[PDB]
Amino acid sequence: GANKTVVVTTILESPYVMMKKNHEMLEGNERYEGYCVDLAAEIAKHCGFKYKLTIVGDGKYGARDADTKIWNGMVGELVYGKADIAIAPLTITLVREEVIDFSKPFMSLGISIMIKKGTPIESAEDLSKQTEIAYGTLDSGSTKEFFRRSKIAVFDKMWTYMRSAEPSVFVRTTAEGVARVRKSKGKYAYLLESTMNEYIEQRKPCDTMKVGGNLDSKGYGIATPKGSSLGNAVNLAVLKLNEQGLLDKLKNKWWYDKGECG
């Protein structure tokens, strides 16, 4: 049929998608700003379509509920036809690639450790060999899944501790993880993707630090329902943007150009 407005599912995660300071006075797509808001614009331009940005209802990235077997988050929105595409920091994983399509990565990343400055921790091994400093991850997504599945000694040890720790060491959003690290006087370390970690490191009150090397290497991809016609065009659009140096500039724009820590 004729062209139709493409429904984009995304998530409120700084600095990918954030509410403009004056969003209360705006409406539609203009309420949002950020790396993925800019990328969405570029993709639509190159693919030739108009779109409506919609924040995922449950605020989740996407996981298959072990109970109901129903996919939640942005992945779910695609799987059940609620949205036509996902433009956000959605990590490309095996379980997800089995149910939806992913474009080649538009950004790279790896699980990392975030500590309050001064915390005596330099690695995952360090965390696994102590109990005074608690640690956790987002309550769902590629990181939690990484630990739940891991057969690597150190990571499995970490998972055994995290899953049974009481009170919970898991958080609902990255913002909550960051807040916990900042208010825990170094007694809480947060495991999240290097990209968000690096961003937060340049935000006031500049009291957090990324320590150690990444535990893995992967990337974010633009997702579409399995078999979607839009998939191929989006993929080529992503590659073109990267080769034009456009993605690199968007990265600098939202991460370092306006860092608040010097």
Place this chain on the structure above:
Amino acid sequence: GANKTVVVTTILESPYVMMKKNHEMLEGNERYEGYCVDLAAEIAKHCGFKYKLTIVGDGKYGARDADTKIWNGMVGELVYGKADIAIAPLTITLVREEVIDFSKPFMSLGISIMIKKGTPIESAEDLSKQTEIAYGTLDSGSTKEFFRRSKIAVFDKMWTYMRSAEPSVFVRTTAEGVARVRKSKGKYAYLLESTMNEYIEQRKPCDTMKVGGNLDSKGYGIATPKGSSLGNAVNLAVLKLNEQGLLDKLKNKWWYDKGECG
């Protein structure tokens, strides 16, 4: 029909595919060793197929000849049905994705600068602002194409110089680029992918160094003829291997576990 031996096209590039020291006494796939030889084995195991490794005839990665319009190298082998899959450090690019399929990346990289230790160069800008130290790239592939296409000031300036430099600053293979840097007393710098650069840095006589940050960010993908049935299984295989930490171990195995520079 029934299963058939899968023809794998690859390229002799250390440490991805190298001739074993005693290859002269061996035959078939057993003549070769390296990261991609190991990856090929893992992919075949996970995808359930047997294969024959064959070194690309022209020794090229793959480019569309401006004259004949014919694709050469490994890309050509796929495009014309000479091979069923390419397992090598083949860079995922737009022009290539338009003619063949690529799995999600199995390794990340970026164009980098290789200098003989001591050379007064720390960046691409540095190179572009001087003439005493000549510089070049492989005579074909994603790096040369990066410069030929680039609209970025500094890189276009570099391309203008390189393309017209006499004698040629381009080389036929990475090995030739490395040799030129090592024998040029610092008067030649080589532009190649960070992965090969980092590998060479840990090889005797340990006289080369990677300097500056990468000029871009991209990845290597396993390639198959456009629409090939093998594509989907290979892609999932790649993701599974990465999530098992297998790719990380292969990287260490062939890059650092046996570095000869400490």
